[model samples]
Target: IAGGEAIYAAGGGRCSLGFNVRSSSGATYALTAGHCTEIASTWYTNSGQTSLLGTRAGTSFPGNDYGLIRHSNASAADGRVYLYNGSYRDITGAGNAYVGQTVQRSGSTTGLHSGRVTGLNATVNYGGGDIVSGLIQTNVCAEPGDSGGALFAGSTALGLTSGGSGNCRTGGTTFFQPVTEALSAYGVSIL
Candidate 1:
């Protein structure tokens, strides 16, 4: 479907689309949490698996938490994030997150949630030293299926949902892998 929408990866469970990306060579891709990619090789738009999304191109997890899925059907892709309010946010570019900047996150599980960037270059240990560095920490709460969702400030894309504790109901700290870093690593740019 589109960015911020629900994506089902076979047995990998559900995760949100982080953003639509394009490589310098003009190839289109879907960005998401690397952990999601680590779980499955194929992704779909529907839970029934009728709509094929793409195949996993690459993934970096634990060390970083982002993945790239090469789009098999380019026309099905949209370079925007779902607002969850019957609207969409066009991602013009990607950038680093700064503390105190207010941001919003979108996912299929929690829909849309907003909070402030509380820290930058933060690290999270998902236990067993499954540590991730260079994260953008925020007060924005995220639930289990929200991983790989878009974290943005207006038109600028900020990060990808990595992992965090707490739920949207009781509130919890969430960490995001800086989008700019992921884009750079993948040799892609926001479309």
Candidate 2:
């Protein structure tokens, strides 16, 4: 699977892929939500866990919500975000999100949804001590399986889907973990 597609971690729930990244050492990886990485180490392409994705390299949660997964078999790893319509968008680089910027979220559960970045560096309290700060807030709606999806604008990788209230049915606020931070932390660039 590619970014915006469903990725099932071992014993962990399914979460959307955020982006495909590459390190200076030539290692390929998948960028996703840190909370998903926190739940498990190994990842898969399907729910049955037959297809190997890789193992968790690093995970940052609470203070931040981004994770890095070293691809075991990165032959399918690409720089494009899966649009789920037999088409995809190439991600050139990671960018910082600004308020009022138009963006689209590509996720497994909802496919794709458009919205504007309503705020930046938003602090959200998910309760139970999952308080993530420095998030990009948006009016785009997402669901449970949509976690770790890609929040992007044009060819720029913007953010990774973070938890927020409401569902895609009625529309509600959503938060994203900035991609720039994750890239720097992992020393990976959008491939």
Candidate 3:
């Protein structure tokens, strides 16, 4: 444990959404935002030739910005950890996203962004292009390429980036689709 840290976000860039392992029906899988893993796009890791997180099997933006990336192989580095700053008392992805609870998002753009759960079941109007519902809004700063990233609290998995109006420079709010929704859509579970 003296050389390097683990690489995150199967794809690398300025802003990339984080990823986490999920298990559904006993089958292990990976989850991310649909837009980030867009349809048929080949993904990569910081070192791998082409990690290929997977293609978007199903996606819905306005209604709900969520998608399922059918990842067949797990990177030896894929894992979730707490950021330590905005820690919630006792949170987990056992149920639904709650308002007033603390949350954090891991992305290629902004390593680990944390904030309070301002709104749950939030309907976000992202510049009139993609209006998403059932999102969790937080006072986090994220930018382009961060979509489809991982949102979670402690050991509980949460949402994926839908979109927001601000950036890391000026600071803004971001929304994410509940992980459960993506899990249900893909008929898979978080490992």
Candidate 4:
């Protein structure tokens, strides 16, 4: 969400806490809660302008709750990096990480949070349909407006938020849709 007022869940149009994760394939994508994409969500930046990362590309909920948005290339950019502030990182694509591994996340709502990997291949019952499986759980707590944000570690992105209990105030567990999974669904390569 480059120029939107806030990332949202299924109900409110506020940015939900989440992170941006990178895949080994050399691309970056936003990770947020599944409830965030109800009614084909629209997005902008922190200021609600249709500039940078705008709107959700492939939004879905219930069975599978994840969405992908293609970033806009600068007038002189070939779209080779994840634009943040005034810098960028070349995406090698999303890579796999094991439990106990340390990770971090960046979002408009909560900024950043770090923790160790928790579980993998766990089932999340969001009252939907055992929504996600084979997930990479982390000890990261995010807040509203942080949804669809970025989660990364030393230039390596992990994934975005998919919603969970707890808040960044204390410590909470946040789920992401895994960058590798998102890339496969979006069918776009990071350059």
Candidate 5:
């Protein structure tokens, strides 16, 4: 599956997919938020759960909010982040978020939204005890199903959609987990 598409957990939880990446061990994985993986081990591409996606490859960190699902069938993955339009952009690289740079976020729920990188915080509380740090803060708007979405600047991926006290209408705070950290953690590269 491509980034920004719907990923459904067996528990009936739904979230967005992030970038697709390759491992040195000749494996392909899809990135998403760890909490999404925490919901269930088996994930599917559709709500009906008819197709098998993959199992978690142990990259989840609910404390930091990054997760990886190693693809069972690696043939159908790509490096593009879905724009929720008729098109998508090729994510050529991953990078650190810099304040004042405008970025775009694409998700299954909210489609795509643009905002600026405001700053970073030490930690964010998603309570029921979910916590993440080294976050990339932004003014972007995201919602429930948008979690685990892709945050990109041109062809580069910046972060994963972490929640904030915002909505599409009210336009509240948006937080993200930097993509580079996750890539390095798993020794994976953008597909």
Candidate 6:
């Protein structure tokens, strides 16, 4: 599996891989939404309940929605998003998202979908004061288990799927945590 591929949290829920990252020290990690990490410590690549992928290395939610998973099986990591059309998009780097730019998203639940960047540095209230700021708002639809997926523009990674309302079946709003922020905060770069 590659980025945007399905990954299971041991006792929690499943999410899409955001990106494959590596630190200056050469340690590899998989980036995703922090809320997913808050659910479990360990992750698995297979849904058959086998193949340990890694464990949560760090997480930032509420204030931010990014997390990193220390790689237990580095070779399984790939710097690409599965297109769900029997192809994949190779991610080259990270960049800031701008309003009016078209972007695509990939997730375990939705496969692949797209929309234009509706707003930048947008904020969302996940209810109960669990507000997240600096999100990239888009008309792209998403659903449960789609959180932490990749949001990219061609080869450049833009953000990690956060949360919003509605589903792919009837159109929805989705927000994403900028990928550059996650890379900077964790001292890692897109691999």
Q: Highest lDDT: which candidate? A: 2
In order, the Cα lDDT scores of the candidates are 0.90, 0.91, 0.58, 0.55, 0.87, 0.90
lDDT of 3 by residue, 1-191 (tens): 00011223344432243444455444444455655444444444444535444444455556777654444465432444424344322223434677888877766555577887788777876565756787888888777766766677766777777778789888998887887776676666544
- What total of clashing residue pairs does each candidate reach? 0, 0, 15, 42, 0, 0
**TM-score pick, better of 3 and 6:** 6
- Which scores better on TM-score, 4 or 5? 5
In model 6, residue pairs whose N, Cα or C atoms come closer than 3 Å (at least 3 residues apart or on different chains), thus clashing, are none
Q: Give me the displacement of residue 60 in model 6, in angstroms.
A: 0.4
Model 6 scores a TM of 0.97
What 10-residue stretch in candidate 3 is worst by lDDT? 1-10
Q: Give each model a TM-score.
A: 0.96, 0.97, 0.72, 0.69, 0.96, 0.97
Superposed by TM-score, candidate 3 places the C-alpha of residue 99 at a distance from the truth, in angstroms, of 1.8
Q: Which pairs, if any, clash in model 2?
A: none
Q: Write one digit per residue (lDDT tens) for candidate 6, span 1-191.
A: 58888889996579988999999998999999998888899999888758888999999999899998998977877878899999988899888888899999999998899999998778888787788999999999999888999999989999999988899999999999998888999899988
Q: lDDT per residue, candidate 5, 1-191, as tens digits?
A: 78999999886999999889899987899999987887788889998999989888865665688899988888857889988778989999998888899999999988999999999864788777777888888999998999999999999999998788779998977889998888989999999
**Candidate 1 residues 76-135, lDDT tens each?**
679899989899878898877889999999989999999999988889887876788889
Please state the error at residue 21 of candidate 4 in Å: 11
Count backbone clashes in candidate 3: 15
Kindly state the number of residue pairs that clash in model 6. Answer: 0
- Candidate 4: where are CA atoms >4 Å away? 1-12, 16-34, 46-55, 70-92, 128-130
User: Which stretch of 10 consecutive residues in model 6 shows the poorest summed lDDT?
Assistant: 73-82
